[PDB]
mmCIF file of C-alpha atoms and ligand atoms in Angstrom:
data_model
loop_
_atom_site.group_PDB
_atom_site.id
_atom_site.type_symbol
_atom_site.label_atom_id
_atom_site.label_comp_id
_atom_site.label_asym_id
_atom_site.label_seq_id
_atom_site.Cartn_x
_atom_site.Cartn_y
_atom_site.Cartn_z
ATOM 1 C CA UNK A 1 -31.544 4.537 17.038
ATOM 2 C CA UNK A 2 -30.127 7.392 14.779
ATOM 3 C CA UNK A 3 -26.558 8.813 14.705
ATOM 4 C CA UNK A 4 -24.539 11.436 12.811
ATOM 5 C CA UNK A 5 -21.853 9.971 10.472
ATOM 6 C CA UNK A 6 -19.427 11.411 7.944
ATOM 7 C CA UNK A 7 -20.191 9.343 4.930
ATOM 8 C CA UNK A 8 -18.722 8.758 1.505
ATOM 9 C CA UNK A 9 -22.143 8.285 -0.179
ATOM 10 C CA UNK A 10 -21.088 8.023 -3.830
ATOM 11 C CA UNK A 11 -18.079 8.418 -6.161
ATOM 12 C CA UNK A 12 -16.784 11.976 -6.425
ATOM 13 C CA UNK A 13 -15.173 14.710 -4.326
ATOM 14 C CA UNK A 14 -16.183 15.293 -0.703
ATOM 15 C CA UNK A 15 -18.433 13.565 1.822
ATOM 16 C CA UNK A 16 -21.880 14.049 3.384
ATOM 17 C CA UNK A 17 -22.889 14.382 6.956
ATOM 18 C CA UNK A 18 -25.860 12.071 7.349
ATOM 19 C CA UNK A 19 -27.970 10.468 10.046
ATOM 20 C CA UNK A 20 -28.159 6.661 9.968
ATOM 21 C CA UNK A 21 -29.171 3.742 12.179
ATOM 22 C CA UNK A 22 -26.786 2.909 14.975
ATOM 23 C CA UNK A 23 -25.274 -0.460 13.905
ATOM 24 C CA UNK A 24 -25.843 -3.635 15.897
ATOM 25 C CA UNK A 25 -22.801 -5.739 16.847
ATOM 26 C CA UNK A 26 -23.068 -9.307 15.611
ATOM 27 C CA UNK A 27 -20.904 -12.310 16.538
ATOM 28 C CA UNK A 28 -17.324 -11.289 17.366
ATOM 29 C CA UNK A 29 -18.151 -7.604 17.251
ATOM 30 C CA UNK A 30 -18.518 -4.865 19.816
ATOM 31 C CA UNK A 31 -20.084 -1.411 19.555
ATOM 32 C CA UNK A 32 -18.199 1.585 20.828
ATOM 33 C CA UNK A 33 -19.273 5.105 21.435
ATOM 34 C CA UNK A 34 -16.788 7.500 19.862
ATOM 35 C CA UNK A 35 -15.061 9.957 22.198
ATOM 36 C CA UNK A 36 -12.434 11.369 19.887
ATOM 37 C CA UNK A 37 -11.504 10.640 16.335
ATOM 38 C CA UNK A 38 -8.808 11.995 14.012
ATOM 39 C CA UNK A 39 -8.212 12.360 10.348
ATOM 40 C CA UNK A 40 -5.520 10.358 8.468
ATOM 41 C CA UNK A 41 -3.989 11.170 5.042
ATOM 42 C CA UNK A 42 -5.877 8.067 3.883
ATOM 43 C CA UNK A 43 -9.177 9.821 4.853
ATOM 44 C CA UNK A 44 -8.069 12.869 2.882
ATOM 45 C CA UNK A 45 -7.445 10.776 -0.262
ATOM 46 C CA UNK A 46 -10.872 9.136 0.094
ATOM 47 C CA UNK A 47 -12.398 12.663 0.465
ATOM 48 C CA UNK A 48 -10.468 13.951 -2.577
ATOM 49 C CA UNK A 49 -11.377 10.766 -4.396
ATOM 50 C CA UNK A 50 -7.917 10.126 -5.950
ATOM 51 C CA UNK A 51 -7.063 7.126 -8.153
ATOM 52 C CA UNK A 52 -6.275 4.931 -5.160
ATOM 53 C CA UNK A 53 -9.626 5.629 -3.500
ATOM 54 C CA UNK A 54 -11.375 5.000 -6.859
ATOM 55 C CA UNK A 55 -9.765 1.513 -7.010
ATOM 56 C CA UNK A 56 -10.509 0.716 -3.381
ATOM 57 C CA UNK A 57 -13.650 2.370 -1.889
ATOM 58 C CA UNK A 58 -17.254 1.014 -2.505
ATOM 59 C CA UNK A 59 -19.715 3.718 -1.483
ATOM 60 C CA UNK A 60 -21.671 4.133 0.590
ATOM 61 C CA UNK A 61 -19.308 3.895 3.609
ATOM 62 C CA UNK A 62 -18.693 5.704 6.864
ATOM 63 C CA UNK A 63 -15.237 7.326 6.808
ATOM 64 C CA UNK A 64 -12.420 7.426 9.398
ATOM 65 C CA UNK A 65 -10.396 4.902 11.440
ATOM 66 C CA UNK A 66 -8.322 6.589 14.161
ATOM 67 C CA UNK A 67 -10.354 6.467 17.362
ATOM 68 C CA UNK A 68 -10.729 6.660 21.109
ATOM 69 C CA UNK A 69 -14.038 5.324 22.398
ATOM 70 C CA UNK A 70 -16.004 3.475 25.068
ATOM 71 C CA UNK A 71 -17.468 -0.025 24.689
ATOM 72 C CA UNK A 72 -21.326 0.316 25.033
ATOM 73 C CA UNK A 73 -22.431 -3.099 23.643
ATOM 74 C CA UNK A 74 -20.902 -6.594 23.220
ATOM 75 C CA UNK A 75 -21.916 -8.956 20.378
ATOM 76 C CA UNK A 76 -22.557 -12.711 20.960
ATOM 77 C CA UNK A 77 -19.504 -14.893 21.735
ATOM 78 C CA UNK A 78 -17.293 -11.933 22.638
ATOM 79 C CA UNK A 79 -15.065 -12.597 25.636
ATOM 80 C CA UNK A 80 -12.558 -10.393 27.399
ATOM 81 C CA UNK A 81 -14.185 -7.038 26.583
ATOM 82 C CA UNK A 82 -16.735 -5.407 28.855
ATOM 83 C CA UNK A 83 -19.201 -2.551 28.471
ATOM 84 C CA UNK A 84 -17.485 0.623 29.774
ATOM 85 C CA UNK A 85 -13.989 -0.365 28.525
ATOM 86 C CA UNK A 86 -11.960 2.569 27.146
ATOM 87 C CA UNK A 87 -10.608 1.452 23.749
ATOM 88 C CA UNK A 88 -8.879 2.256 20.457
ATOM 89 C CA UNK A 89 -8.797 0.342 17.226
ATOM 90 C CA UNK A 90 -6.164 -1.471 15.209
ATOM 91 C CA UNK A 91 -7.103 -1.208 11.545
ATOM 92 C CA UNK A 92 -5.379 -4.274 10.055
ATOM 93 C CA UNK A 93 -7.858 -7.159 10.110
ATOM 94 C CA UNK A 94 -5.688 -10.207 9.629
ATOM 95 C CA UNK A 95 -6.498 -13.752 8.540
ATOM 96 C CA UNK A 96 -4.433 -15.755 11.076
ATOM 97 C CA UNK A 97 -3.794 -18.359 8.369
ATOM 98 C CA UNK A 98 -1.198 -17.174 5.827
ATOM 99 C CA UNK A 99 2.590 -17.663 6.124
ATOM 100 C CA UNK A 100 3.026 -14.029 7.376
ATOM 101 C CA UNK A 101 0.440 -14.431 10.165
ATOM 102 C CA UNK A 102 1.730 -17.864 11.165
ATOM 103 C CA UNK A 103 5.259 -16.352 11.549
ATOM 104 C CA UNK A 104 3.791 -13.589 13.754
ATOM 105 C CA UNK A 105 4.206 -10.859 11.036
ATOM 106 C CA UNK A 106 0.560 -9.824 11.218
ATOM 107 C CA UNK A 107 1.284 -6.306 9.946
ATOM 108 C CA UNK A 108 1.972 -7.832 6.484
ATOM 109 C CA UNK A 109 -0.792 -10.420 6.507
ATOM 110 C CA UNK A 110 -1.215 -11.695 2.967
ATOM 111 C CA UNK A 111 -5.029 -11.326 3.159
ATOM 112 C CA UNK A 112 -5.248 -8.007 5.038
ATOM 113 C CA UNK A 113 -8.542 -6.023 5.154
ATOM 114 C CA UNK A 114 -8.417 -2.487 6.463
ATOM 115 C CA UNK A 115 -10.959 -1.178 8.981
ATOM 116 C CA UNK A 116 -12.447 2.122 7.729
ATOM 117 C CA UNK A 117 -11.246 1.464 4.165
ATOM 118 C CA UNK A 118 -12.738 -1.893 3.371
ATOM 119 C CA UNK A 119 -15.353 -1.398 6.099
ATOM 120 C CA UNK A 120 -17.424 1.387 7.746
ATOM 121 C CA UNK A 121 -15.270 3.591 9.937
ATOM 122 C CA UNK A 122 -15.441 5.724 13.028
ATOM 123 C CA UNK A 123 -16.378 9.293 11.981
ATOM 124 C CA UNK A 124 -19.774 8.724 13.590
ATOM 125 C CA UNK A 125 -21.253 8.693 17.023
ATOM 126 C CA UNK A 126 -20.906 4.873 17.285
ATOM 127 C CA UNK A 127 -18.985 2.231 15.411
ATOM 128 C CA UNK A 128 -19.034 -1.517 15.165
ATOM 129 C CA UNK A 129 -15.507 -3.065 15.522
ATOM 130 C CA UNK A 130 -14.211 -6.663 15.286
ATOM 131 C CA UNK A 131 -13.485 -7.681 18.887
ATOM 132 C CA UNK A 132 -9.972 -8.926 17.990
ATOM 133 C CA UNK A 133 -9.106 -5.388 16.784
ATOM 134 C CA UNK A 134 -9.935 -3.783 20.074
ATOM 135 C CA UNK A 135 -7.103 -2.248 22.170
ATOM 136 C CA UNK A 136 -7.830 -1.455 25.824
ATOM 137 C CA UNK A 137 -6.526 1.955 26.898
ATOM 138 C CA UNK A 138 -5.368 2.961 30.353
ATOM 139 C CA UNK A 139 -7.873 5.519 31.703
ATOM 140 C CA UNK A 140 -5.174 8.142 32.348
ATOM 141 C CA UNK A 141 -4.675 8.761 28.582
ATOM 142 C CA UNK A 142 -6.942 11.566 27.276
ATOM 143 C CA UNK A 143 -9.071 10.706 24.210
ATOM 144 C CA UNK A 144 -7.300 13.371 22.137
ATOM 145 C CA UNK A 145 -4.019 11.453 22.580
ATOM 146 C CA UNK A 146 -5.459 7.924 22.493
ATOM 147 C CA UNK A 147 -6.973 8.675 19.095
ATOM 148 C CA UNK A 148 -3.438 9.276 17.725
ATOM 149 C CA UNK A 149 -2.262 5.722 18.580
ATOM 150 C CA UNK A 150 -2.415 4.330 15.040
ATOM 151 C CA UNK A 151 -0.160 6.872 13.381
ATOM 152 C CA UNK A 152 1.809 7.064 16.599
ATOM 153 C CA UNK A 153 2.403 3.300 16.184
ATOM 154 C CA UNK A 154 3.654 3.775 12.626
ATOM 155 C CA UNK A 155 6.052 6.422 14.005
ATOM 156 C CA UNK A 156 7.191 4.114 16.819
ATOM 157 C CA UNK A 157 7.978 1.299 14.371
ATOM 158 C CA UNK A 158 9.907 3.626 12.065
ATOM 159 C CA UNK A 159 11.958 5.290 14.909
ATOM 160 C CA UNK A 160 12.502 2.129 16.931
ATOM 161 C CA UNK A 161 13.237 -0.323 14.108
ATOM 162 C CA UNK A 162 16.778 -0.214 15.576
ATOM 163 C CA UNK A 163 18.602 1.375 18.549
ATOM 164 C CA UNK A 164 17.972 5.160 18.800
ATOM 165 C CA UNK A 165 19.119 6.370 22.235
ATOM 166 C CA UNK A 166 22.177 8.623 21.859
ATOM 167 C CA UNK A 167 21.990 8.287 18.051
ATOM 168 C CA UNK A 168 22.095 11.177 15.554
ATOM 169 C CA UNK A 169 19.016 11.208 13.346
ATOM 170 C CA UNK A 170 17.838 12.729 10.136
ATOM 171 C CA UNK A 171 14.056 12.873 9.595
ATOM 172 C CA UNK A 172 12.796 13.960 6.157
ATOM 173 C CA UNK A 173 9.126 15.136 6.278
ATOM 174 C CA UNK A 174 7.282 16.928 9.073
ATOM 175 C CA UNK A 175 3.722 16.192 8.167
ATOM 176 C CA UNK A 176 1.811 14.527 10.984
ATOM 177 C CA UNK A 177 3.727 11.206 10.730
ATOM 178 C CA UNK A 178 7.133 12.917 10.819
ATOM 179 C CA UNK A 179 6.073 15.173 13.724
ATOM 180 C CA UNK A 180 5.035 12.113 15.668
ATOM 181 C CA UNK A 181 8.466 10.606 14.728
ATOM 182 C CA UNK A 182 10.184 13.624 16.229
ATOM 183 C CA UNK A 183 8.216 13.216 19.428
ATOM 184 C CA UNK A 184 9.072 9.485 19.627
ATOM 185 C CA UNK A 185 12.723 10.019 18.730
ATOM 186 C CA UNK A 186 13.198 12.754 21.388
ATOM 187 C CA UNK A 187 11.393 10.776 24.077
ATOM 188 C CA UNK A 188 13.652 7.805 23.205
ATOM 189 C CA UNK A 189 16.933 9.702 23.643
ATOM 190 C CA UNK A 190 17.961 10.497 19.964
ATOM 191 C CA UNK A 191 20.243 13.511 19.560
ATOM 192 C CA UNK A 192 20.749 15.479 17.473
ATOM 193 C CA UNK A 193 17.418 15.033 15.631
ATOM 194 C CA UNK A 194 17.684 16.941 12.383
ATOM 195 C CA UNK A 195 14.446 17.584 10.477
ATOM 196 C CA UNK A 196 14.187 18.491 6.817
ATOM 197 C CA UNK A 197 10.819 19.971 5.712
ATOM 198 C CA UNK A 198 10.099 22.629 2.962
ATOM 199 C CA UNK A 199 6.826 23.911 4.440
ATOM 200 C CA UNK A 200 7.532 26.876 6.747
ATOM 201 C CA UNK A 201 4.519 26.162 8.963
ATOM 202 C CA UNK A 202 5.431 22.398 9.427
ATOM 203 C CA UNK A 203 9.138 23.097 9.857
ATOM 204 C CA UNK A 204 8.285 25.481 12.671
ATOM 205 C CA UNK A 205 5.989 22.803 14.208
ATOM 206 C CA UNK A 206 8.953 20.342 14.043
ATOM 207 C CA UNK A 207 10.991 22.802 16.128
ATOM 208 C CA UNK A 208 8.204 23.199 18.702
ATOM 209 C CA UNK A 209 7.793 19.438 18.973
ATOM 210 C CA UNK A 210 11.533 19.158 19.649
ATOM 211 C CA UNK A 211 13.784 18.992 16.564
ATOM 212 C CA UNK A 212 17.332 19.950 17.444
ATOM 213 C CA UNK A 213 18.038 21.341 13.929
ATOM 214 C CA UNK A 214 15.645 22.133 11.074
ATOM 215 C CA UNK A 215 16.483 22.409 7.399
ATOM 216 C CA UNK A 216 14.438 23.818 4.470
ATOM 217 C CA UNK A 217 15.601 21.575 1.622
ATOM 218 C CA UNK A 218 14.185 24.016 -0.985
ATOM 219 C CA UNK A 219 16.760 26.654 0.213
ATOM 220 C CA UNK A 220 19.610 24.674 1.856
ATOM 221 C CA UNK A 221 21.787 21.736 0.759
ATOM 222 C CA UNK A 222 20.513 19.018 3.167
ATOM 223 C CA UNK A 223 23.540 16.692 2.918
ATOM 224 C CA UNK A 224 26.088 19.530 3.436
ATOM 225 C CA UNK A 225 24.185 20.827 6.477
ATOM 226 C CA UNK A 226 23.984 17.320 7.907
ATOM 227 C CA UNK A 227 27.762 16.873 7.386
ATOM 228 C CA UNK A 228 28.318 20.106 9.338
ATOM 229 C CA UNK A 229 26.191 18.973 12.283
ATOM 230 C CA UNK A 230 27.736 15.473 12.486
ATOM 231 C CA UNK A 231 31.321 16.628 11.880
ATOM 232 C CA UNK A 232 31.525 14.977 8.489
ATOM 233 C CA UNK A 233 30.442 11.554 9.698
ATOM 234 C CA UNK A 234 26.775 11.513 8.737
ATOM 235 C CA UNK A 235 23.763 10.564 10.831
ATOM 236 C CA UNK A 236 23.495 7.181 12.614
ATOM 237 C CA UNK A 237 19.865 6.907 11.655
ATOM 238 C CA UNK A 238 17.790 8.140 8.678
ATOM 239 C CA UNK A 239 13.921 8.049 8.906
ATOM 240 C CA UNK A 240 11.993 8.815 5.722
ATOM 241 C CA UNK A 241 8.627 10.310 6.542
ATOM 242 C CA UNK A 242 7.882 12.493 3.377
ATOM 243 C CA UNK A 243 7.544 10.122 0.379
ATOM 244 C CA UNK A 244 9.559 12.584 -1.704
ATOM 245 C CA UNK A 245 12.097 10.827 -4.061
ATOM 246 C CA UNK A 246 14.603 13.607 -3.518
ATOM 247 C CA UNK A 247 14.427 13.228 0.268
ATOM 248 C CA UNK A 248 15.165 9.450 -0.024
ATOM 249 C CA UNK A 249 18.298 10.223 -2.078
ATOM 250 C CA UNK A 250 19.435 12.899 0.391
ATOM 251 C CA UNK A 251 18.971 10.647 3.455
ATOM 252 C CA UNK A 252 20.903 7.784 1.803
ATOM 253 C CA UNK A 253 23.738 10.309 1.081
ATOM 254 C CA UNK A 254 23.588 11.804 4.605
ATOM 255 C CA UNK A 255 23.521 8.534 6.579
ATOM 256 C CA UNK A 256 26.796 7.345 8.108
ATOM 257 C CA UNK A 257 28.461 4.224 6.643
ATOM 258 C CA UNK A 258 26.918 1.095 8.142
ATOM 259 C CA UNK A 259 24.044 3.233 9.500
ATOM 260 C CA UNK A 260 20.367 2.416 9.633
ATOM 261 C CA UNK A 261 17.455 3.558 7.522
ATOM 262 C CA UNK A 262 13.699 3.223 8.112
ATOM 263 C CA UNK A 263 11.321 3.949 5.197
ATOM 264 C CA UNK A 264 7.687 4.868 5.969
ATOM 265 C CA UNK A 265 6.776 7.484 3.360
ATOM 266 C CA UNK A 266 5.318 6.387 0.038
ATOM 267 C CA UNK A 267 6.603 7.817 -3.265
ATOM 268 C CA UNK A 268 4.549 8.996 -6.309
ATOM 269 C CA UNK A 269 5.956 6.004 -8.273
ATOM 270 C CA UNK A 270 9.196 4.008 -8.739
ATOM 271 C CA UNK A 271 12.350 5.759 -7.525
ATOM 272 C CA UNK A 272 15.732 5.755 -9.268
ATOM 273 C CA UNK A 273 18.541 5.245 -6.782
ATOM 274 C CA UNK A 274 22.316 4.810 -6.660
ATOM 275 C CA UNK A 275 22.276 1.411 -4.890
ATOM 276 C CA UNK A 276 26.014 0.751 -5.465
ATOM 277 C CA UNK A 277 27.378 3.871 -3.782
ATOM 278 C CA UNK A 278 24.660 4.648 -1.254
ATOM 279 C CA UNK A 279 23.357 1.283 -0.030
ATOM 280 C CA UNK A 280 25.851 -1.417 -0.927
ATOM 281 C CA UNK A 281 29.230 0.385 -0.535
ATOM 282 C CA UNK A 282 27.832 1.996 2.633
ATOM 283 C CA UNK A 283 26.697 -1.434 3.908
ATOM 284 C CA UNK A 284 23.349 0.037 5.084
ATOM 285 C CA UNK A 285 20.598 -1.675 7.041
ATOM 286 C CA UNK A 286 17.268 -0.628 5.493
ATOM 287 C CA UNK A 287 13.793 -1.336 7.009
ATOM 288 C CA UNK A 288 10.579 -0.860 5.112
ATOM 289 C CA UNK A 289 7.858 0.068 7.615
ATOM 290 C CA UNK A 290 4.114 -0.579 7.231
ATOM 291 C CA UNK A 291 1.322 -0.980 9.818
ATOM 292 C CA UNK A 292 2.117 -1.827 13.437
ATOM 293 C CA UNK A 293 3.429 -4.921 15.125
ATOM 294 C CA UNK A 294 0.420 -6.523 16.790
ATOM 295 C CA UNK A 295 0.550 -6.136 19.781
ATOM 296 C CA UNK A 296 4.071 -5.133 20.829
ATOM 297 C CA UNK A 297 3.883 -1.737 19.011
ATOM 298 C CA UNK A 298 0.615 -0.887 20.846
ATOM 299 C CA UNK A 299 2.199 -1.691 24.265
ATOM 300 C CA UNK A 300 5.177 0.555 23.421
ATOM 301 C CA UNK A 301 2.883 3.377 22.224
ATOM 302 C CA UNK A 302 0.707 3.027 25.382
ATOM 303 C CA UNK A 303 3.685 3.259 27.750
ATOM 304 C CA UNK A 304 5.132 6.238 25.889
ATOM 305 C CA UNK A 305 1.741 7.984 26.237
ATOM 306 C CA UNK A 306 1.648 7.213 29.955
ATOM 307 C CA UNK A 307 5.229 8.412 30.490
ATOM 308 C CA UNK A 308 4.251 12.011 29.453
ATOM 309 C CA UNK A 309 7.479 12.304 27.458
ATOM 310 C CA UNK A 310 5.822 12.628 24.001
ATOM 311 C CA UNK A 311 5.408 16.309 23.108
ATOM 312 C CA UNK A 312 2.107 15.930 21.309
ATOM 313 C CA UNK A 313 0.331 19.250 22.108
ATOM 314 C CA UNK A 314 2.058 21.175 19.366
ATOM 315 C CA UNK A 315 1.056 18.510 16.845
ATOM 316 C CA UNK A 316 -2.732 18.761 17.531
ATOM 317 C CA UNK A 317 -3.279 22.021 15.646
ATOM 318 C CA UNK A 318 -7.137 21.772 15.434
ATOM 319 C CA UNK A 319 -9.636 20.308 17.906
ATOM 320 C CA UNK A 320 -13.239 20.461 16.620
ATOM 321 C CA UNK A 321 -16.424 19.956 18.620
ATOM 322 C CA UNK A 322 -18.356 17.331 16.728
ATOM 323 C CA UNK A 323 -18.438 16.935 12.996
ATOM 324 C CA UNK A 324 -20.143 20.122 11.665
ATOM 325 C CA UNK A 325 -16.861 21.656 10.398
ATOM 326 C CA UNK A 326 -15.572 18.550 8.581
ATOM 327 C CA UNK A 327 -15.486 20.430 5.241
ATOM 328 C CA UNK A 328 -13.224 23.094 6.730
ATOM 329 C CA UNK A 329 -11.073 20.385 8.462
ATOM 330 C CA UNK A 330 -10.498 18.504 5.181
ATOM 331 C CA UNK A 331 -9.784 21.698 3.228
ATOM 332 C CA UNK A 332 -7.190 22.898 5.824
ATOM 333 C CA UNK A 333 -5.413 19.558 5.585
ATOM 334 C CA UNK A 334 -5.361 19.670 1.822
ATOM 335 C CA UNK A 335 -3.769 23.125 2.143
ATOM 336 C CA UNK A 336 -0.961 21.749 4.402
ATOM 337 C CA UNK A 337 -2.076 24.068 7.175
ATOM 338 C CA UNK A 338 -2.375 21.264 9.786
ATOM 339 C CA UNK A 339 -0.508 18.988 12.222
ATOM 340 C CA UNK A 340 -3.287 16.622 13.329
ATOM 341 C CA UNK A 341 -7.011 17.516 13.414
ATOM 342 C CA UNK A 342 -9.089 15.835 16.187
ATOM 343 C CA UNK A 343 -12.956 15.651 16.325
ATOM 344 C CA UNK A 344 -14.079 15.694 19.946
ATOM 345 C CA UNK A 345 -17.530 14.096 20.623
ATOM 346 C CA UNK A 346 -19.989 14.929 23.422
HETATM 347 N N1 NAD B 1 2.332 1.967 5.887
HETATM 348 C C1 NAD B 1 3.089 3.005 5.535
HETATM 349 O O1 NAD B 1 4.379 2.866 4.876
HETATM 350 C C2 NAD B 1 2.455 4.350 5.842
HETATM 351 C C3 NAD B 1 1.623 4.627 6.965
HETATM 352 C C4 NAD B 1 1.249 5.952 7.269
HETATM 353 C C5 NAD B 1 1.685 6.969 6.405
HETATM 354 N N2 NAD B 1 2.476 6.659 5.314
HETATM 355 C C6 NAD B 1 3.079 7.638 4.384
HETATM 356 O O2 NAD B 1 3.971 8.384 5.210
HETATM 357 C C7 NAD B 1 4.197 9.687 4.590
HETATM 358 C C8 NAD B 1 3.884 10.779 5.619
HETATM 359 O O3 NAD B 1 2.494 10.797 5.946
HETATM 360 P P1 NAD B 1 1.813 12.173 6.380
HETATM 361 O O4 NAD B 1 0.379 11.913 6.611
HETATM 362 O O5 NAD B 1 2.672 12.751 7.473
HETATM 363 O O6 NAD B 1 1.998 12.944 4.992
HETATM 364 P P2 NAD B 1 1.949 14.519 4.602
HETATM 365 O O7 NAD B 1 1.887 14.506 3.160
HETATM 366 O O8 NAD B 1 1.088 15.260 5.516
HETATM 367 O O9 NAD B 1 3.456 15.013 4.911
HETATM 368 C C9 NAD B 1 4.591 14.748 4.115
HETATM 369 C C10 NAD B 1 5.530 15.941 4.362
HETATM 370 O O10 NAD B 1 6.618 15.795 3.474
HETATM 371 C C11 NAD B 1 7.064 17.112 3.139
HETATM 372 N N3 NAD B 1 8.003 17.132 2.008
HETATM 373 C C12 NAD B 1 7.717 17.220 0.619
HETATM 374 N N4 NAD B 1 8.894 17.185 -0.066
HETATM 375 C C13 NAD B 1 9.925 17.077 0.814
HETATM 376 C C14 NAD B 1 11.310 17.013 0.674
HETATM 377 N N5 NAD B 1 11.946 16.943 -0.488
HETATM 378 N N6 NAD B 1 12.068 16.831 1.784
HETATM 379 C C15 NAD B 1 11.497 16.820 3.017
HETATM 380 N N7 NAD B 1 10.168 16.925 3.175
HETATM 381 C C16 NAD B 1 9.373 17.024 2.101
HETATM 382 C C17 NAD B 1 5.726 17.826 2.852
HETATM 383 O O11 NAD B 1 5.920 19.224 2.950
HETATM 384 C C18 NAD B 1 4.858 17.300 3.985
HETATM 385 O O12 NAD B 1 4.815 18.231 5.075
HETATM 386 C C19 NAD B 1 3.307 9.768 3.356
HETATM 387 O O13 NAD B 1 4.090 9.401 2.230
HETATM 388 C C20 NAD B 1 2.253 8.681 3.620
HETATM 389 O O14 NAD B 1 1.716 8.154 2.418
HETATM 390 C C21 NAD B 1 2.862 5.382 5.042
HETATM 391 ZN ZN1 ZN B 2 -2.734 -13.540 7.318
#
């Protein structure tokens, strides 16, 4: 009847490790036992209690949303899920009713609620989950990889928004999302994959994951280096994984005419851009990326996991046993000292 949870108990910095009642799954819900769980930048912002989290979180609430778990209990009415199923969780809870949903664009549902943001999450021993947000995992995939499927899906949709095999690529940003992008891009045949990242630690991770070239944009002229690599032609594909305004401008300069751009990173505010010369006169195709395409992106992610071609080990920089060191985990992330952190549960 009791379980450990990482909990945002009240407004302010940080979180508390508490013991609470194991939830009961009601109609259309299942209860999973958590096997592995990982920390998202969203979780960090809730911990730090920034302006966004202030506008969005009602304490008290269990934190976290990336998960690998086992179904232990089914709520009434639930079909198609059985006790013992190995599962992960899609966080967009969609209405099924708006124009976006009815066109099959669930990832931009007009009435979206976010699991672990608008609801209790998964940094706990057990979690209740809407049954329609359950993804069944093949048993071959280890929990430490299965827990990365949400951000891995974001990375898949950014990388694969167009053709990528045999394409030259610039990635700006090698935080966890960008690192996962590198892994996806290399497993999908991109070369050369050029990665721009000012942090020395993350830039070296990008190389271990598989970047063909790395660039420190605080010391090197990104666009000039990219012109050297691509013999003056620019990259076929530009993937923006940093949310830095200057990186957006560099990638739009570095991309080949009529090339393709995917934008995942989110900027501190509005950006000021030369649309005439960089987007219009270059005839670019630009994709904004958010969420995951439900369920095609999850099938793609699942096969890429099973193929063994994603080089994910270098990205998991910290694997903790249970939740006791959550304070240290969140502080290391804040410091930029991380790839992904995984909590492993007994
Ligand atoms: N739905 C979405 O569009 C969605 C989903 C997931 C994440 N995100 C966003 O994706 C971005 C990446 O997420 P993350 O968790 O990996 O973030 P993160 O902050 O850990 O990493 C961003 C990286 O960008 C690097 N960087 C800063 N300035 C740069 C510059 N000028 N050029 C190149 N790199 C630079 C930083 O050093 C950092 O390593 C963030 O903006 C995040 O908000 C968006
Ligand atoms: Zn909808």
